């Protein structure tokens, strides 16, 4: 059970004592359904002001303005759920984590 | 800490008509060691124009919805009556004469 | 056709219970989690590390495999992330989250805590490269995980030969479970229905 | 009779009028449970009685 | 709530019981489950359920 | 009630009600409609019967405590290492409950050649059927049925 | 929270009331937008062109 | 299923175990209950109306809110892709208007009086002090006439300036259970030919 | 044996295996054995190990 | 699929190559879609609209 002899095993065709589990994690690309309630939330909007600042062809202007959000429901105000199903992103191959 | 405790409520002179005149005008600063919060400005100084604040947004509070034991459907089921002197029943009956 | 996907190899003895595999099951050969408590704090550790008792789950053993599952086995020292013996990798390892023991506090109860676990949780992997390495520092995107938060691995459509996995009737696959010393697992995972065939 | 307990006073007894009014809510709300409990109680199966 | 009432149900199964008569271990066919052993092990009394 | 409490005052509200049932024959029919989660489990959970003390014991003692240190292994529920003498012999607690209330079974012995075909249907497990159920000429006719 | 009134051996209940806080969270939206030197040169012309 | 199983709460360990085994039989189950059922459009409009009347309300304080032209009051927005919608819209879900009528106005709010000189001097703010202040002191000062009675409602005294007007906007209700619902899929309106996903 | 994203027919031999039980780490037994002497250990027998 | 699974444009190699193997599954599949799909009404009026 030596790695070298197990390296010999294994590229021979010999099968030592011993199994295993292959663990393998997969994304999706899926299309969401989500509901929200009427009194949801609670959205305060504030007052723009600019920014100054040059850029290689002239100046930019950055207009920025601070909002802030609150839930006023006592439970739960939105459930979403997933719905459909799209094409997988990602492979199903066999490609083995070398360590 | 304790300092900043006590300048940290009813902040500095923040516009506040004067209750009192105080009188003897000499120089303060030989002894700061009374008061809790000593601060000395040559001219002018940008600390003295601050106005961040707390708010609160509302309170919300809901009223019960009493129920009446004869609106709802099982009060169908029984024949309620008020009997006051209840206590004082050893053993009632009641008879059927069934032919 | 895509990303590649790793697959990390935990070892275990052969003469291991075939029917295990064949629902919803654990890697780690133990069920483990912060989901069952109620009584005290310190149990989360004596759910997935204590051997003096059986399993919560299967409730008449300690644990499938002996190899994977006490508190420093050999799959144990090679796949927690506590002890960062892979930390110098930049490859993604699928069975990091089903070893190491999650940060916990106790102050909430269990079925808010699990809606607040539930939700859109930041992502684990990578998505532009193609190798599925660690996740870029400061990488934003938010993938709704289900089996992760309730420990569980669901088993695909496999067989150890290609003659039961499909049938002579141009049309279903193979439905035989064990012939001689091979094996046919069904199809547990939320796709029943779709990736064709 | 000071301006600082009068509020006081008055929260004392707002609260005590509306915990008493669910209490008295509450026997409006018992019978119906009791009136199934004893009929729960009373009832023969029916696939016996049948 | 009331109405969300329990019932208790018993199961029954016996374990080790061995069919005595010769007549009634029977195959409804010929190679319904077979091994490669000499012997087949279902002949053999069983020890479970 | 004028009651006194940990900080104040208590007031119970106690009122006296009665009921009768002014109905000739049968008047509520209930009946079992759906099926929600079952409670417990449908384990293998073994029942262990050195819970209990009072019968007679064995002349050696070495032989009932490897007895019961055999019987615990192999097992889920036992009595505790100790043997707490003036106890109740409870099972030591465990971590977590994954799925319900483990429900226990009891075992019966029987002769190896027992018919298969009575176990078939709703069967009796004493192996001889009884109740109150059956009578028609006398009072006790119940331990006839049951033990005769 | 509401009431029922019960007999037999179950405690009798007083109704509970409850408080609770929630706090606003600060987000913001940012927007660019950008003048070329150009066209500031042009804008800048302070009455000679 | 926590929100059905569980009727009140304070739930012990084996009504809790019970909960969990109906949790992970629910979420391997209803997985992609749209893309998975679509030949069974009643079993969607089953799960839709469970999704609808499965969350609780919020607070009823408003001046003008969104209704349809008939004058219900609409009860929140189902939003959704547009493969999604138009899959409701053709077979599923019915109808019920084609125009609303939203608020136009925002409803400002300002610090001013005494809320002004409270921010400048101690540092805190609260909104409508005046209106308050008017129902602490007419409830506090004045005799019985007026004192004993403190009901829990909207209130809203004096509350000068305002504009409840509405516009017809043409947008598609449908209606699931009992409720009035929005269903919206914007995906032409906003986030196209922009680089944002 | 099992199927492909596009449901194309794949094979893990246990020559994949090799990438992670043919490490150094196989024989990386000092802290298991740390961690193991630092338990309660009762005087057990000397035969098989003497 | 180019107008439906990309929202924009620009992929990277994963997306890119996702979409390829979507775009071969479906000029396999809807090549002959008025001779295969003949007998239903409705699969034609749904891939013409």
Same mark, same amino acid.
């Given at each position: 059970?030596?790695?070298? @002899?197990?390296?010999?095993?294994?590229?021979?065709?010999?099968?030592?004592?011993?199994?295993?589990?292959?663990?393998?994690?997969?994304?999706?690309?899926?299309?969401?359904?989500?509901?929200?309630?009427?009194? @949801?939330?609670?959205?305060?909007?504030?007052?723009?002001?600019?920014?100054?600042?040059?850029?290689?062809?002239?100046?930019?202007?950055?207009?920025?303005?601070?909002?802030?959000?609150?839930? #006023?429901?006592?439970?739960?105000?939105?459930?979403?759920?997933?719905?459909?199903?799209?094409?997988?992103?990602?492979?199903?191959?066999?490609?083995?984590?070398? #360590? | 800490? /304790?300092?900043?405790?006590?300048?940290?409520?009813?902040?500095?002179?923040?516009?506040?008509?004067?209750? +009192?005149?105080?009188?003897?005008?000499?120089?303060?600063?030989?002894?700061?060691?009374?008061?809790?919060?000593?601060?000395?400005?040559?001219?002018?100084?940008?600390? %003295?124009?601050?106005?961040?604040?707390?708010?609160?947004? +509302?309170?919300?509070?809901?009223?019960?919805?009493?129920?009446?034991? %004869?609106? %709802?459907?099982?009060?169908?089921?029984?024949?309620?009556?008020?009997?006051?002197?209840?206590?004082?029943?050893?053993?009632?009956?009641?008879?059927? /004469?069934?032919? | 056709?895509?990303?590649?996907?790793?697959?990390?190899?935990?070892?275990?003895?052969?003469?291991?219970?075939?029917?295990?595999?064949?629902?919803?099951?654990?890697?780690?050969?133990?069920?483990?989690?912060?989901?069952?408590?109620?009584?005290?704090?310190?149990?989360?550790?004596?759910?997935?590390?204590?051997?003096?008792?059986?399993?919560?789950?299967?409730?008449?053993?300690?644990?499938?495999?002996?190899?994977?599952?006490?508190?420093?086995?050999?799959?144990?020292?090679?796949?927690?992330?506590?002890?960062?013996?892979?930390?110098?990798?930049?490859?993604?390892?699928?069975?990091?989250?089903?070893?190491?023991?999650?940060?916990?506090?106790?102050?909430?109860?269990?079925?808010?805590?699990?809606?607040?676990?539930?939700?859109?949780?930041?992502?684990?992997?990578?998505?532009?490269?193609?190798?599925?390495?660690?996740?870029?520092?400061?990488?934003?995107?938010?993938?709704?995980?289900?089996?992760?938060?309730?420990?569980?691995?669901?088993?695909?459509?496999?067989?150890?030969?290609?003659?039961?996995?499909?049938?002579?009737?141009?049309?279903?696959?193979?439905?035989?479970?064990?012939?001689?010393?091979?094996?046919?697992?069904?199809?547990?995972?939320?796709?029943?229905?779709?990736?064709?065939? | 009779?000071?301006?600082?307990?009068?509020?006081?006073?008055?929260?004392?007894?707002?609260?005590?009028?509306?915990?008493?009014?669910?209490?008295?809510?509450?026997?409006?709300?018992?019978?119906?449970?009791?009136?199934?409990?004893?009929?729960?109680?009373?009832?023969?199966?029916?696939?016996?009685?049948? | 709530?009331?109405?969300?009432?329990?019932?208790?149900?018993?199961?029954?199964?016996?374990?080790?019981?061995?069919?005595?008569?010769?007549?009634?271990?029977?195959?409804?066919?010929?190679?319904?489950?077979?091994?490669?052993?000499?012997?087949?092990?279902?002949?053999?009394?069983?020890?479970?359920? | 009630?004028?009651?006194?409490?940990?900080?104040?005052?208590?007031?119970?509200?106690?009122?006296?009600?009665?009921?009768?049932?002014?109905?000739?024959?049968?008047?509520?029919?209930?009946?079992?409609?759906?099926?929600?989660?079952?409670?417990?489990?449908?384990?293998?959970?073994?029942?262990?019967? =050195? =819970?209990?003390?009072?019968?007679?014991?064995?002349?050696?003692?070495?032989?009932?405590?490897?007895?019961?240190?055999?019987?615990?292994?192999?097992?889920?529920?036992?009595?505790?290492?100790?043997?707490?003498?003036?106890?109740?012999?409870?099972?030591?607690?465990?971590?977590?409950?994954?799925?319900?209330?483990?429900?226990?079974?009891? =075992?019966?012995?029987?002769?190896?050649?027992?018919?298969?075909?009575?176990?078939?249907?709703?069967?009796?497990?004493?192996?001889?059927?009884?109740?109150?159920?059956?009578?028609?000429?006398?009072?006790?006719?119940?331990?006839?049925?049951?033990?005769? | 929270?509401?009431?029922?009134?019960?007999?037999?051996?179950?405690?009798?209940?007083?109704?509970?009331?409850? *408080?609770?806080?929630?706090?606003?969270?600060?987000?913001?939206?940012?927007?660019?937008?950008?003048?070329?030197?150009?066209?500031?040169?042009?804008?800048?012309?302070? *009455?000679?062109? | 299923?926590?929100?059905?199983?569980?009727?009140?709460?304070?739930?012990?360990?084996?009504?809790?175990?019970?909960?969990?085994?109906?949790?992970?039989?629910?979420?391997?189950?209803?997985?992609?209950?749209?893309?998975?059922?679509?030949?069974?459009?009643?079993?969607?409009?089953?799960?839709?109306?469970?999704?609808?009347?499965?969350?609780?309300?919020?607070?009823?304080?408003?001046?003008?809110?969104?209704?349809?032209?008939?004058?219900?009051?609409?009860?929140?927005?189902?939003?959704?892709?547009?493969?999604?919608?138009?899959?409701?819209?053709?077979?599923?879900?019915?109808?019920?208007?084609?125009?609303?009528?939203?608020?136009?106005?925002?409803?400002?709010?300002?610090?001013?009086?005494?809320?002004?000189?409270?921010?400048?001097?101690?540092?805190?703010?609260?909104?409508?002090?005046?209106?308050?202040?008017?129902?602490?002191?007419?409830?506090?000062?004045?005799?019985?006439?007026?004192?004993?009675?403190?009901?829990?409602?909207?209130?809203?005294?004096?509350?000068?300036?305002?504009?409840?007007?509405?516009?017809?906007?043409?947008?598609?209700?449908?209606?699931?259970?009992?409720?009035?619902?929005?269903?919206?899929?914007?995906?032409?309106?906003?986030?196209?030919?922009?680089?944002?996903? | 044996?099992?199927?492909?994203?596009?449901?194309?027919?794949?094979?893990?031999?246990?020559?994949?295996?090799?990438?992670?039980?043919?490490?150094?780490?196989?024989?990386? !037994?000092?802290?298991?054995? !740390?961690?193991?002497?630092?338990?309660?250990?009762?005087?057990?027998?000397?035969?098989? !190990?003497?």
């Amino acid at each position: 059970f030596t790695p070298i @002899s197990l390296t010999h095993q294994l590229r021979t065709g010999f099968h030592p004592g011993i199994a295993f589990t292959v663990v393998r994690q997969d994304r999706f690309a899926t299309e969401q359904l989500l509901y929200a309630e009427r009194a @949801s939330e609670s959205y305060f909007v504030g007052q723009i002001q600019v920014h100054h600042h040059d850029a290689i062809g002239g100046v930019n202007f950055t207009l920025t303005q601070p909002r802030a959000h609150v839930d #006023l429901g006592v439970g739960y105000t939105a459930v979403c759920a997933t719905a459909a199903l799209r094409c997988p992103l990602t492979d199903m191959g066999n490609t083995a984590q070398n #360590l | 800490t /304790e300092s900043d405790r006590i300048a940290g409520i009813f902040n500095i002179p923040a516009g506040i008509i004067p209750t +009192g005149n105080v009188l003897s005008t000499i120089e303060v600063c030989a002894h700061r060691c009374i008061f809790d919060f000593f601060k000395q400005i040559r001219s002018d100084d940008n600390s %003295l124009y601050s106005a961040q604040f707390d708010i609160l947004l +509302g309170t919300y509070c809901n009223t019960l919805n009493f129920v009446r034991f %004869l609106e %709802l459907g099982l009060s169908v089921a029984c024949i309620c009556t008020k009997f006051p002197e209840l206590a004082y029943v050893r053993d009632g009956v009641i008879q059927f /004469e069934v032919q | 056709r895509g990303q590649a996907s790793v697959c990390e190899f935990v070892a275990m003895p052969v003469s291991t219970d075939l029917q295990y595999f064949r629902t919803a099951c654990n890697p780690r050969g133990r069920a483990s989690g912060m989901l069952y408590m109620g009584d005290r704090d310190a149990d989360i550790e004596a759910i997935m590390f204590d051997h003096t008792q059986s399993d919560v789950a299967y409730t008449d053993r300690a644990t499938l495999n002996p190899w994977a599952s006490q508190k420093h086995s050999y799959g144990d020292r090679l796949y927690n992330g506590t002890y960062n013996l892979t930390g110098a990798s930049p490859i993604y390892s699928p069975c990091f989250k089903f070893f190491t023991p999650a940060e916990v506090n106790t102050n909430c109860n269990t079925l808010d805590r699990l809606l607040m676990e539930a939700k859109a949780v930041a992502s684990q992997s990578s998505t532009d490269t193609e190798y599925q390495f660690k996740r870029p520092p400061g990488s934003t995107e938010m993938t709704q995980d289900p089996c992760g938060l309730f420990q569980e691995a669901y088993p695909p459509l496999c067989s150890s030969d290609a003659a039961m996995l499909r049938t002579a009737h141009a049309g279903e696959t193979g439905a035989d479970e064990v012939h001689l010393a091979q094996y046919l697992i069904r199809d547990a995972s939320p796709l029943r229905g779709c990736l064709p065939l | 009779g000071t301006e600082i307990d009068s509020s006081l006073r008055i929260r004392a007894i707002q609260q005590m009028a509306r915990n008493l009014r669910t209490v008295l809510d509450s026997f409006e709300r018992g019978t119906a449970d009791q009136l199934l409990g004893v009929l729960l109680e009373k009832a023969p199966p029916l696939s016996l009685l049948s | 709530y009331p109405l969300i009432g329990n019932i208790d149900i018993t199961f029954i199964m016996p374990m080790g019981v061995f069919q005595a008569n010769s007549m009634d271990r029977y195959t409804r066919h010929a190679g319904d489950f077979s091994t490669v052993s000499e012997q087949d092990p279902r002949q053999f009394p069983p020890q479970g359920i | 009630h004028h009651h006194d409490a940990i900080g104040g005052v208590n007031f119970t509200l106690t009122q006296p009600r009665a009921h009768v049932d002014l109905g000739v024959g049968y008047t509520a029919v209930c009946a079992t409609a759906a099926l929600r989660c079952p409670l417990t489990d449908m384990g293998n959970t073994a029942q262990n019967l =050195f =819970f209990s003390r009072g019968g007679v014991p064995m002349l050696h003692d070495n032989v009932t405590e490897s007895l019961r240190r055999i019987t615990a292994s192999g097992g889920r529920l036992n009595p505790t290492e100790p043997l707490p003498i003036f106890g109740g012999l409870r099972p030591a607690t465990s971590a977590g409950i994954a799925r319900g209330q483990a429900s226990v079974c009891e =075992f019966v012995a029987m002769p190896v050649s027992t018919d298969l075909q009575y176990f078939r249907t709703a069967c009796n497990p004493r192996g001889r059927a009884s109740g109150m159920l059956y009578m028609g000429d006398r009072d006790a006719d119940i331990e006839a049925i049951m033990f005769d | 929270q509401p009431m029922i009134a019960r007999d037999g051996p179950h405690p009798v209940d007083q109704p509970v009331h409850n *408080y609770m806080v929630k706090r606003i969270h600060k987000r913001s939206l940012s927007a660019a937008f950008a003048i070329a030197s150009e066209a500031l040169s042009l804008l800048s012309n302070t *009455y000679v062109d | 299923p926590i929100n059905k199983f569980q009727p009140e709460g304070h739930l012990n360990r084996v009504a809790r175990a019970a909960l969990l085994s109906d949790l992970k039989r629910r979420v391997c189950a209803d997985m992609f209950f749209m893309t998975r059922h679509a030949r069974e459009p009643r079993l969607i409009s089953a799960y839709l109306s469970d999704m609808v009347s499965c969350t609780q309300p919020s607070v009823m304080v408003s001046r003008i809110t969104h209704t349809n032209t008939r004058g219900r009051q609409v009860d929140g927005v189902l939003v959704t892709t547009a493969t999604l919608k138009r899959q409701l819209l053709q077979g599923i879900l019915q109808i019920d208007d084609t125009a609303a009528d939203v608020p136009v106005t925002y409803g400002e709010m300002v610090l001013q009086g005494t809320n002004l000189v409270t921010a400048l001097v101690m540092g805190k703010a609260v909104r409508g002090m005046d209106d308050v202040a008017r129902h602490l002191l007419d409830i506090t000062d004045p005799n019985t006439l007026n004192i004993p009675s403190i009901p829990p409602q909207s209130n809203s005294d004096s509350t000068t300036a305002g504009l409840p007007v509405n516009a017809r906007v043409p947008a598609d209700l449908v209606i699931v259970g009992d409720k009035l619902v929005f269903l919206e899929a914007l995906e032409r309106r906003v986030y196209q030919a922009t680089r944002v996903a | 044996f099992f199927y492909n994203k596009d449901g194309i027919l794949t094979q893990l031999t246990l020559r994949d295996a090799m990438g992670t039980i043919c490490h150094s780490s196989l024989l990386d !037994v000092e802290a298991t054995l !740390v961690a193991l002497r630092q338990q309660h250990l009762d005087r057990q027998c000397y035969f098989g !190990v003497y």
